[PDB]
Design a protein around this nucleic acid. Structure first.
Lengths: 50, 51, 772, 696, 50, 51
RNA sequence: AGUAGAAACAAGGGCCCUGC
């Protein structure tokens, strides 16, 4: 339930988990930045198709 | 009955045992008494008697 | 890790498509549920046939591929196949396999570290097994059995809850990061959540399975069955092995599962508060609601609020009914007239007036119903099916098993129907004094005759005589009832029939919203009364264990212990949010400002005056030692603070800190004056009364975000505030804002400021200010 | 649930529910609006919050909960007292420290539209606050007190979660000012139809609706029409005692021949001892072949009866050859192709390629379904029933699982009774026939699954255990593999259920045939076999099966469950009436009628009457068809009549001749139906000596 | 198997709560009640599984 | 009667014997503990001493 | 041939695939 669509919810949760891990867990800034770039590109493609 | 020594299966066969919270033990410390918490066990058993 | 990146790549590839993008863009998240149905839909007519015809194949099962490679499960172990590289048509990521492969795994496959967690996942069924082992069977005998059909519960269950209260409980124990806003059931039942959480944490588990099993652990399975003997969930769970229509496997099963004891305790408490509130004359309604909400009780290990148990129970008794009525709780359509029980099967009617002369000429109004109606009726071990017609008991049939019960059931039915001449001309024995108004409260003539019967057995004999007596016709000799309650006689009562074999309790899965008056008599959209205060026992003395009537009217302690307890309550209420409260001071390490609180200043007069200096030294030491470092126990400062008000001095500290009434507290050990436990860390017990500590800060013991939820609240959304997780949520400052993701597809903004007020008062008061 | 009030009571205070309920009753609006109002009302309430002013007096004064007239009275009173201008519309709350009304709004849509409409409606007269369930705020003045905002937003968040969970967070339950009229979108075509589907006297749905909405009861015309209909009907009522039942008329013609796939009474078997190593069927069929008896057989070209003897002879030779090669397969030649019906499936001819000349060339009339033809009472059925009742010199024919442990007397009782009964039944002949069916059909089912499109060879066998003598002699009696014949399948491509795969049956016997019974078979004189020497015959035929018959025959142990049920019921019923174990007594003493001999009745203890019921249940399993279905469905009416006759309940019926006709309609060429019909006639005859309602 | 313990009470594994002796309440029925008042027994709550 | 007997399978109630057991490996510890001296004292009451 | 019932089966799709 909620007010977000599916794409919005997915994106937001992925960014949150990326931070949650990079803060303490086994993740590097390089990996974090790569993940964030992938996600912003995915959002652009989703919103651009139509 | 109350006890502060966990059981072994061989010596204590007729007994059903539980663990009832904790309790306290009191011992000297210089000129005062102090208290150190320990667990507590409850030993339950049935038996007969006569006159 | 790498998996996270893989999920991100997968989402990107999927968004590159065109249709997938549209479907992931339109609507809210709820669509997931819909999409979950349009896929993988395929059934079969006769699965037995297809199982015998499918298992006859070579590779009839599917299975994961990567899991088999990782487990190093070979193929063709000993000339017997185990699987082959292929792709099932539906999954496309599974590979065909054979049944033998399963056995291979079970015998020489990968082993998990431990599996005793299973005993917790399936607690209900291991509970069945354990209860069974403690049964002592007996001989078997043959005879016919009188099995009555009725609705019962087959699952012994502690803390029966609702469904909305489980769907959330399944989240805070298993999927906590995806948990929604904290609901009232959570904040109130904290120890319960902590308990269910301690077992299923840091364990290898399949969570869908665990979640379903939790639903089963909290369900009383209600069934409409034939039944014989006592009614207890422990028997109903194994009724199949206790008796049928022609045999009985005797066995004693009395001392197991302790269910009905809790229910009888609840009813005793309800009777207590109902009578107490009845003591009033003008506010029995508000008095009763207040007494209810101001009470608590222990259930097994957990502490529950009374008003929460009352809205969960199903005891159709004239006491539970009133309470459930005051609290606006819907309930079933079961009547009650004194000790008996009643339930309407068919018919209708409407009130009508009539009068009777008590002594000589003294007109007294009493009502009756002007139509025909049919009723099931139940007294102890006796059943009846009767009909009333315009102030008359038309017919009645009985299926009980005792003469005494038969006579009493018949008599209470005659009264319930206003049948007889007594309702036309009352007896001489009754007078205007016995009429009504113990202290002003009238009494309808019905209950008057009721108590007149319960007073002396000879009144009951006379009332039965009020029913016509005649000579037993031929043939009907067996189905006739005398005055003694004998299955046959030469002269029997009129229009009465007996039989062996109880009557089937009717059934209806209906609910009704009733109300009540200022005299505590509930009504149901009609002039009919379903419950009252005259149909329950007069009085009795009882010693309740594990109960908390933290309300003035319901208290027996002296002003001294009450003063201590109220001081502790006031001192805890300062545990909220905002500066000047103890959490902020601890955070700032201002251990000095605590000594100067006003609350300690109100408890100061209670300290032993001749040694107030010595205690002060010791007390301050503990506090500073705990605050300067950060390793403190929130339940210990709240205990010793009241002693830090005076100035330190020198002397020998025995080990205890005494008040002025020879009641002490000892710093480190639980005693009668101040107790608490790591199991339920949200309670403080003072002189038995319980005190609820708010959930604003969490010390070393409390170990999750569960302990912070009463400190946050929602506010107007602000895009400037930062966005954080649920774990960094502890590092915010009192009064700050932060955005956060809640449940699924939802983002909000919270502010670390609490609001102790509720809606009950803000609604009730403003309402009463409208009836003027 | 069950009402919007009950739903709303979930997240509101029951008080606000009662208020909003009385309000909707006042305006008479759709009660689905109990929810919005309660929510709105509670917000206003918790906005008051019992705050106080500088003068120690209340600061806010609610006016929403009140009636409309009273609300207008207070609004004007306050506009006058504090010397304020009267407003055109009503408001929700009024404060005193500022002396200006305040209006509260709520909405779900994340846009200012609701606040724009309200601000246009009221301009800047008073203070307006519109909150959103998703955390937004729009106003025309300074913000409220902090605590007010926190409490309100928190409440609205909980409410939104609850509603979204109940699927009620929609325009329906939470509409704006405009979208408050929900209605079925009656289109154009649908209305055109509804006014056309009306009953006769009316011609437009409006007339019918007005006639139904105002219909009043007139009991007298109803009674008149009821009586009139009661007179032109003349329902017959026929007490059976006066109108008795004729006998049932079985059909006429030849006798119904043997139909079960396997032989039961004429079957002969070769036995050997079983070794656990060689246990499959395809192996047992070879072990029996090595000892040499199976190869001594050699039928001749002259059959005692039947047709197509050459094909059967060649097929038997190929069967022996295939067994000798250790590969249970047969080739597709002219013989096997003819007996297995390989290529005799119709050929398709699309109509698009059809013409009148084609039809006239080769007549293409519609297929004339040729329903079955009748038969007569079978006279060989009673012989089978008496043969399947006796012991068989061996036991353990039907495999069974083990007994679990026991802990209470009940389970001891259960084990004991179950052991006695199973020991009685496992020794009969009906049991060996059940075991034969179980194992042979299991083998055929497996083959059909693995080797379709291939003619195979499957034995007809069984496994048993020789009986237990006393401890004397050789102890530990041995096991046995028995072989009754050979079976052959033919390309069982069961692409779809209910299909058919023909099979062929070569069986061994020592009893010559009868033309009436063994009509379908093609018997041959094979040679000799021992016992002294005795002739041997070879019964051969062709038949079929399907997925369903396979599945059901393999599950032929249900007969035990039913039989045990009947017996145990009788015993416990007799034991309960006396409150004592009368189980052994009831089994050894209570006698049951079985049949007639020399015109007298016969009876025997329950312990020995079980076998009749068991055989009845097995035959139900074997000969079941639609005919037997209909018959067993129509005989209950007669038995209920019989019971009413036994207990002096004066039965009656409406048309008994029609019942007898329905029964006799389903009697055609089915040995079980015909047999049971003759026996039902005889039952009513034999009872007529003791009861009425039956004619002779 | 080894011979198990038999005496009625426990000797070595025992434990005892203590309190000061009052000559006016020197009876079993009274001693037990007093021991219960200070609330150390009511706190003994055995868990379900032994 | 005889039928009742045959029905219930009545027989003479078999008498059980105590099973033999091994040597206890906890007796010496109990003896040792018993010989020690208790913190409290005066457990057993006795009468007085005449002149 | 045969089966079964009040119509269907006695392979079906593209040499290969399969059995709801």
């Amino acid at each position: 339930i909620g007010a977000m669509s599916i794409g919005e919810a997915i994106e937001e949760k992925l960014l949150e988990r990326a931070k949650m891990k990079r803060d303490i867990g086994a993740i590097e800034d390089s990996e974090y930045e790569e993940i964030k770039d992938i996600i912003r590109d995915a959002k652009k493609a989703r919103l651009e198709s139509r | 009955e109350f006890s502060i020594r966990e059981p072994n299966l061989e010596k204590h066969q007729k007994y059903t045992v539980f663990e009832a919270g904790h309790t306290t033990v009191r011992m000297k410390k210089g000129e005062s008494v102090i208290g150190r918490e320990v667990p507590l066990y409850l030993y339950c058993r049935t038996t007969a008697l006569s006159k | 890790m790498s998996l996270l990146l893989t999920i991100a790549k997968e989402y990107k590839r999927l968004c590159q498509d065109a249709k997938a993008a549209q479907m992931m863009t339109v609507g809210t998240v709820s669509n997931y549920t819909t999409f979950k149905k349009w896929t993988t839909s395929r059934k079969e007519k006769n699965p037995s046939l297809r199982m015998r015809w499918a298992m006859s194949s070579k590779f009839p099962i599917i299975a994961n591929k990567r899991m088999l490679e990782e487990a190093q499960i070979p193929k063709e172990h000993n000339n017997v196949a185990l699987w082959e590289d292929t792709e099932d048509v539906s999954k496309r990521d599974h590979v065909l396999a054979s049944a033998s492969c399963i056995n291979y795994w079970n015998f020489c496959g990968p082993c998990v570290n431990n599996s005793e967690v299973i005993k917790e996942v399936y607690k209900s069924r291991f509970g069945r097994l354990e209860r069974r082992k403690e049964i002592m069977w007996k001989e078997l005998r043959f005879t016919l059995v009188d099995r009555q059909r009725r609705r019962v519960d087959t699952q012994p269950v502690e803390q029966r809850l609702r469904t909305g209260e489980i769907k959330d409980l399944q989240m805070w124990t298993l999927f906590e990061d995806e948990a929604p806003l904290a609901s009232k059931f959570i904040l109130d039942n904290y120890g319960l959540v902590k308990e269910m959480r301690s077992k299923f944490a840091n364990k290898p588990l399949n969570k869908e399975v665990v979640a379903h099993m939790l639903e089963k652990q909290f369900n009383p399975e209600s069934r409409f069955l034939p039944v014989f003997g006592a009614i207890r969930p422990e028997r109903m769970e194994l009724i199949h092995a206790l008796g049928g229509e022609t045999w009985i496997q005797e066995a004693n099963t009395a001392g197991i599962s302790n269910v009905d004891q809790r229910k009888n305790d609840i009813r005793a408490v309800c009777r207590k508060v109902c009578l107490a509130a009845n003591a009033s004359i003008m506010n029995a309604k508000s008095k009763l609601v207040e007494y209810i909400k101001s009470t608590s009780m222990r259930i097994g290990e957990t502490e529950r609020k009374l008003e929460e148990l009352i809205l969960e129970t199903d005891d159709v008794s004239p006491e539970v009914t009133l309470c459930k009525s005051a609290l606006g709780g819907q309930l079933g359509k079961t009547l009650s007239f004194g000790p008996m029980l009643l339930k309407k099967i068919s018919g209708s009617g409407v009130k009508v007036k009539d009068t009777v002369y008590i002594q000589g000429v003294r007109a007294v109004q009493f009502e009756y119903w002007s139509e025909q109606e049919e009723f099931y009726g139940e007294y102890k071990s006796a059943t009846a099916l009767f009909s009333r017609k315009e102030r008359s008991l038309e017919w009645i049939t009985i299926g009980g098993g005792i003469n005494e019960d038969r006579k009493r059931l018949l008599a209470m039915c005659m009264i319930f129907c206003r049948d007889g001449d007594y309702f036309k001309d009352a007896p001489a024995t009754i007078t205007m004094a016995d009429l009504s108004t113990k202290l002003g409260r009238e009494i309808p003539y019905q209950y008057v005759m009721m108590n007149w019967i319960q007073k002396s057995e000879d009144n009951l004999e006379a009332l039965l005589y009020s029913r016509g007596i005649v000579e037993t016709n031929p043939g009907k000799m067996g189905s006739s009832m005398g005055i003694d309650g004998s299955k046959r006689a030469i002269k029997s009562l009129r229009a009465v029939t007996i039989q062996s074999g109880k009557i089937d309790m009717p059934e209806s899965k209906e609910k009704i919203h009733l109300e009540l008056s200022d005299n505590l008599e509930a009504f149901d959209s009609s002039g009919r009364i379903v419950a009252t205060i005259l149909d329950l026992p007069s009085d009795k003395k009882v010693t309740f264990q594990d109960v908390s009537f933290q309300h003035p009217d319901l208290a027996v302690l002296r002003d001294e212990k009450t003063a201590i307890t109220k001081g502790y309550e006031a001192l805890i209420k300062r545990l909220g949010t905002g500066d000047n409260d103890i959490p902020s001071l601890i955070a700032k390490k201002d251990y000095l400002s605590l000594y100067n609180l006003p609350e300690v200043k109100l408890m100061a007069p209670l300290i032993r005056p001749n040694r107030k200096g010595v205690y002060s030294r010791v007390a301050r030491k503990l506090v500073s030692t705990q605050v300067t470092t950060g390793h403190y126990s929130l339940h210990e400062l709240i205990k010793v603070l009241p002693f830090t008000y005076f100035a330190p001095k020198q002397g020998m500290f025995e080990g205890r800190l005494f008040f002025s009434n020879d009641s002490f507290v000892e710093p480190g050990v639980n005693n009668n004056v101040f107790s608490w436990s790591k199991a339920d860390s949200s309670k403080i017990y003072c002189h038995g009364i319980a005190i609820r500590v708010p959930l604003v800060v969490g010390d070393e013991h409390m170990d999750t975000s569960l302990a912070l939820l009463e400190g946050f609240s929602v506010c107007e959304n602000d895009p400037r505030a930062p966005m954080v997780t649920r774990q960094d949520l502890i590092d915010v400052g009192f009064g700050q804002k932060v955005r956060l993701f809640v449940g699924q597809g939802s983002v909000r903004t919270f502010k670390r400021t609490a609001s102790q007020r509720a809606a009950s008062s803000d609604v009730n008061k403003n309402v009463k200010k409208i009836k003027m | 649930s069950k009402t919007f009030a009950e739903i709303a009571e979930a997240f509101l205070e029951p008080e606000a529910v009662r208020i909003a309920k009385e309000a909707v009753e006042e305006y008479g609006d759709h009660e689905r609006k109990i929810i919005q109002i309660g929510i709105h009302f509670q917000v206003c309430c918790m906005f008051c919050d019992e705050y106080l002013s500088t003068n120690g007096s209340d600061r806010f004064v609610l006016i929403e909960g009140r009636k409309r007239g009273t609300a207008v009275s207070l609004q004007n009173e306050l506009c006058k007292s504090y010397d304020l201008e009267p407003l055109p519309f009503l408001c929700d709350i009024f404060d005193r420290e500022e002396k200006q009304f305040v209006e509260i709004g709520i909405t779900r849509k994340a846009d200012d539209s609701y606040f724009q409409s309200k601000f246009g409606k009221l301009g800047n007269s008073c203070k307006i606050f519109v909150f959103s369930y998703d955390g937004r705020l729009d106003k025309n003045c300074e913000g409220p007190m902090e605590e007010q905002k926190l409490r309100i937003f928190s409440f609205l968040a909980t409410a939104a979660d609850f509603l979204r969970k109940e699927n009620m967070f929609n325009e329906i339950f939470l509409p704006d000012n405009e979208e408050t009229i929900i209605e079925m979108k009656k289109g154009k075509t649908f209305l055109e139809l509804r006014d056309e589907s009306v009953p006769l006297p009316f011609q437009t749905y409006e007339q019918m609706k007005d006639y139904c909405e105002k219909f009043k009861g007139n009991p007298r015309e109803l009674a008149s029409k009821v009586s009139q209909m009661q007179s032109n009907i003349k329902l017959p009522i026929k007490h059976y005692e006066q109108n008795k039942f004729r006998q049932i008329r079985l059909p006429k013609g030849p006798m119904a021949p043997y139909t079960h796939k396997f032989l039961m009474e004429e079957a002969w078997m070769f036995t050997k001892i079983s070794d656990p190593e060689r246990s499959r069927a395809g192996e047992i069929l070879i072990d029996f072949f090595k000892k040499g008896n199976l190869s001594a057989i050699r039928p001749k070209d002259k059959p005692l009866q039947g047709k197509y003897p050459i094909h059967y002879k060649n097929l038997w030779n190929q069967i022996k050859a295939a067994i000798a090669d250790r590969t249970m397969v047969i080739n597709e030649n002219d013989h096997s192709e003819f007996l297995g019906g390989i290529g005799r499936a119709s050929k398709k001819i699309p109509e698009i390629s059809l013409t009148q000349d084609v039809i006239t060339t080769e007549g293409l009339k519609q297929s004339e379904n040729k329903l079955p033809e009748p038969r007569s009472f079978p006279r060989w059925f009673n012989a089978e029933w008496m043969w399947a009742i006796k012991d068989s010199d061996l036991t353990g024919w039907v495999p069974m699982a083990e007994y679990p442990p026991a802990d209470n007397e009940l389970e001891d009782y259960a084990e004991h009774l179950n052991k006695t009964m199973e020991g009685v039944l496992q020794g009969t002949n009906c049991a060996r026939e059940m075991g034969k069916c179980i194992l042979t059909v299991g083998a055929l089912m497996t083959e059909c699954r693995l080797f379709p499109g291939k003619i195979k060879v499957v034995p007809i066998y069984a496994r048993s255990k020789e009986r237990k003598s006393m401890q004397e002699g050789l102890p530990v009696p041995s096991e046995m593999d028995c072989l009754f014949g050979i079976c052959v399948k033919s390309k069982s491509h069961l692409n779809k259920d209910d299909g058919m795969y023909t099979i062929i049956t070569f069986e061994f016997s020592i009893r010559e045939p009868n033309l009436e019974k063994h009509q379908k078979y093609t018997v041959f004189e094979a040679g000799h076999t021992t016992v002294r020497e005795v002739p041997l015959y070879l019964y051969c035929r062709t038949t079929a099966l399907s997925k369903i018959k396979n599945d059901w025959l393999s599950k032929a142990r249900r007969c035990f469950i039913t039989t045990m049920d009947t017996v145990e019921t009788i015993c416990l019923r007799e034991s309960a009436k006396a409150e004592e174990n009368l189980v052994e007594k009831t089994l050894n003493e209570k006698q049951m009628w079985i049949g007639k001999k020399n015109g007298e009745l016969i009876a025997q203890p329950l312990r020995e009457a079980l076998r009749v019921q068991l055989v009845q249940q097995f035959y139900f399993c074997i000969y079941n068809d639609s005919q037997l279905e209909g018959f067993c469905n129509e005989q209950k009416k007669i038995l209920m009549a019989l019971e009413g006759d036994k207990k002096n309940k004066s039965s009656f019926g409406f048309n008994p001749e029609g019942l007898l006709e329905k029964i006799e309609e389903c009697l055609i060429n089915n040995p079980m139906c015909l047999f049971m019909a003759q026996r039902l006639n005889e039952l009513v005859i034999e009872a007529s000596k003791r009861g009425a309602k039956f004619f002779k």
